[PDB]
A = this chain, B = another copy of it.
Amino acid sequence: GSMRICIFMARGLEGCGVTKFSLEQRDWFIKNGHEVTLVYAKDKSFTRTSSHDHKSFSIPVILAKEYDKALKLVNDCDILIINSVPATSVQEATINNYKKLLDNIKPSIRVVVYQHDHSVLSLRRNLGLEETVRRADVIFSHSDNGDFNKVLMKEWYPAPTVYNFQPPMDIVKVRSTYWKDVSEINMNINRWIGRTTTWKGFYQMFDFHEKFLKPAGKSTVMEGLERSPAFIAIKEKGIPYEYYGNREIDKMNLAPNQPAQILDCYINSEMLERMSKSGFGYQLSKLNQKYLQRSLEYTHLELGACGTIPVFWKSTGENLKFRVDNTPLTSHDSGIIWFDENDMESTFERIKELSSDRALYDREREKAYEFLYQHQDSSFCFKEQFDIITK
């Protein structure tokens, strides 16, 4: 009903899914007639702060020394949406003032908390999440069976209702901006996008390239594999690769019989353009079923929306439920290739078929785009969330 919305990332602007969600959320609220202020605590900085285009509208605030500025911001809205909380690495002043903010927000402001993390390992790396949840008037999580719901919430309430949510994207806009004529897509390029955490399936991508793609003369690119501590393991296993920074992308060896070409971190818009011209995009996220309900990740949606053939993790499609009828995603003729770890041959065979038949290729991606649109477009999902928020 035409309200003022303050979207708050108290952990900081990290540049990944929480930042992307906040940006898509802002867009939806603006598109639907509401006013939005996007605020983030800058007490902690992150590598991917520039990955998304937010600087022309985001408002940074140092919780440690600008409590007053933060307080006026969060209190100048009708609905306060908190998508992240301070990390366990911040100084006492930061968590102290954050907690102080929670206590001094007008009682009338509707506080909505979205928990974006899955594993308890990540959930524990938060400070003030308990007081955040206690002040929340509405709470969303990615799964009724996840650690947030089954571990933390039971720990705090031995209780408010926790609603499920999917992180939506304006899939129409992405396509309108990057979709390419199939004739301009290089069937030899296989592009994986993700992060350096085991459940993103980087090991499986290296394995698939070594056993099927490389031998078949194809090229593999992996974007987003930052050299964080987790990357140490890739070095210890002795996996072959060629690493490139963001200022040396054009110096990437995209010829056959080459190791996987790795990119550190990417600018979202630049990646979408490269992907729109890539034969196959890979998103191998493979979370434990307990974390899956209806949520695909932004990288899943980005593949389908930009026009490449999406290659997803089978068990992920099997354990996720289509938004329209709650049926497994794998039960639909979506055009998506469900990467099978125990049978990569069939996976590569499907890829071969598509690579040699532009018509079949085009038909299949059109199916993927419409399937993904129906499943997680902002026009549907944010409306569901809005109804729950204003319930």
A-side residues, CB < 8 A to B, are: 42, 62, 64-65, 236-238
Using A42-B236, A65-B236, A65-B237 as known contacts, list a sample of 4 further A-B pairs with CB atoms less than 8 Å apart, ordered by residue number in A: A62-B236, A64-B236, A64-B237, A65-B238
Chain A interface SS verdict (over half): loop
Inter-chain CA distance A238–B236, complex, in Å, is 41
Q: Give the Cβ gap from A172 to chain B, nearest Cβ, in Å.
A: 39
Assembly stoichiometry (copies): 2
Complex partner residue of A238 from B42, B64, B237, B238, CB under 8 angstroms: B64
Q: Give the Cβ gap from A259 to chain B, nearest Cβ, in Å.
A: 15
CB-nearest residue of chain B relative to A233? B45
With a CB–CB cut-off of 8 A, which chain B residues contact A236? 42, 62, 64-65
Of A42, A64, A236, most buried by chain B (CB within 10 Å of CB) is: A236
With a CB–CB cut-off of 8 A, which chain B residues contact A237? 64-65
Q: Give the Cβ gap from A126 to chain B, nearest Cβ, in Å.
A: 18
CB-nearest residue of chain B relative to A238? B65
With a CB–CB cut-off of 8 A, which chain B residues contact A65? 236-238
8 A-B pairs with CB atoms under 8 Å apart are A42-B236, A62-B236, A64-B236, A64-B237, A64-B238, A65-B236, A65-B237, A65-B238
CB-nearest residue of chain B relative to A65? B238
- A-B pairs with the 8 shortest C-beta distances? A65-B238, A62-B236, A65-B236, A64-B238, A42-B236, A65-B237, A64-B237, A64-B236
Q: Give the Cβ gap from A237 to chain B, nearest Cβ, in Å.
A: 8
CB-nearest residue of chain B relative to A93? B238
CB-nearest residue of chain B relative to A236? B62
